[PDB]
Amino acid sequence: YKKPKLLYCSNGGHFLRILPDGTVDGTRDRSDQHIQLQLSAESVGEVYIKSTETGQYLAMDTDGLLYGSQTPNEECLFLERLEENHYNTYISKKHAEKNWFVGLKKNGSCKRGPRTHYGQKAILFLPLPVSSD
């Protein structure tokens, strides 16, 4: 069943899910349906994080701390960098002008520009949707 993809971050075993507290952060849950974000690459170079039912109403602020619950504006848009061996990266297309990275802590907390760059390996993520196998 192809559908909204999952927020895989390098391994601390979490899944990034939205809460009404202004967050989409990782907790290990696939038991409910909070972890389903519809992630396409809609424009050239841009990937779009849109909510399915719970999938994320993200807003990038300051371009460092990216939090989302109520609305998904386009600030949610980030530029996708393709690493080899099929790993994906995100650039913060909000301040893309300054080359700042989108990096998330799924194993942590909502995503943190103070270390978005290779400070943390939480800047290494995979987009894994439910697949029709």
From Swiss-Prot:
The keyword Cytoplasm is annotated on this UniProt entry: yes
Outcome of substituting K105E: Reduced integrin-binding. Defective in integrin-, heparin- and FGFR1-binding, and defective in inducing FGF1 signaling, cell proliferation and cell migration
Processing after translation: In the nucleus, phosphorylated by PKC/PRKCD.
Pfam families: FGF
Annotated PROSITE patterns: HBGF_FGF
Keyword Zinc-finger: no
Mutation effect (N88A): No effect on integrin-binding. No effect on integrin- and heparin-binding, loss of FGFR1-binding, defective in inducing FGF1 signaling, cell proliferation and cell migration
Key words, A-Z: Acetylation, Angiogenesis, Cytoplasm, Developmental protein, Differentiation, Growth factor, Heparin-binding, Mitogen, Nucleus, Phosphoprotein, Secreted
Tissue distribution of the protein: Predominantly expressed in kidney and brain. Detected at much lower levels in heart and skeletal muscle.
GO cellular component, one term: cytoplasm
Compartment(s) of residence: Secreted; Cytoplasm; Cytoplasm, Cell cortex; Cytoplasm, Cytosol
InterPro entries documented for this protein: Fibroblast_GF_fam (IPR002209), IL1/FGF (IPR008996)
SUPFAM superfamilies: Cytokine (SSF50353)
Main location: secreted
Motif Nuclear localization signal, residue numbers: 2-5
Gene Ontology molecular function: fibroblast growth factor receptor binding; growth factor activity; heparin binding; integrin binding; S100 protein binding
Residues covered by region (Heparin-binding): 105-121
Outcome of substituting R28E: Dominant-negative mutant. Defective in integrin-binding and in ternary complex formation with integrin and FGFR1. No effect on heparin- and FGFR1-binding. Defective in inducing FGF1 signaling, cell proliferation and cell migration
BP GO annotations: activation of protein kinase B activity; anatomical structure morphogenesis; angiogenesis; branch elongation involved in ureteric bud branching; cellular response to heat; epithelial cell proliferation; fibroblast growth factor receptor signaling pathway; lung development
Coiled coil regions, renumbered to chain: none
Annotated heparin binding sites: N11
Quaternary structure and partners: Monomer. Homodimer. Interacts with FGFR1, FGFR2, FGFR3 and FGFR4. Affinity between fibroblast growth factors (FGFs) and their receptors is increased by heparan sulfate glycosaminoglycans that function as coreceptors. Found in a complex with FGFBP1, FGF1 and FGF2. Interacts with FGFBP1. Part of a Cu(2+)-dependent multiprotein aggregate containing FGF1, S100A13 and SYT1. Interacts with SYT1. Interacts with S100A13. Interacts with LRRC59. Interacts with CSNKA, CSNKB and FIBP. While binding with LRRC59, CSNKA and FIBP seem mutually exclusive, CSNKB and FIBP may cooperatively interact with FGF1.
Annotated function: Plays an important role in the regulation of cell survival, cell division, angiogenesis, cell differentiation and cell migration. Functions as a potent mitogen in vitro. Acts as a ligand for FGFR1 and integrins. Binds to FGFR1 in the presence of heparin leading to FGFR1 dimerization and activation via sequential autophosphorylation on tyrosine residues which act as docking sites for interacting proteins, leading to the activation of several signaling cascades. Binds to integrin ITGAV:ITGB3.
Assigned protein family: Belongs to the heparin-binding growth factors family.
Protein name, as recorded: Fibroblast growth factor 1
Organism encoding this protein: Homo sapiens (Human)
Gene name in the database record: FGF1
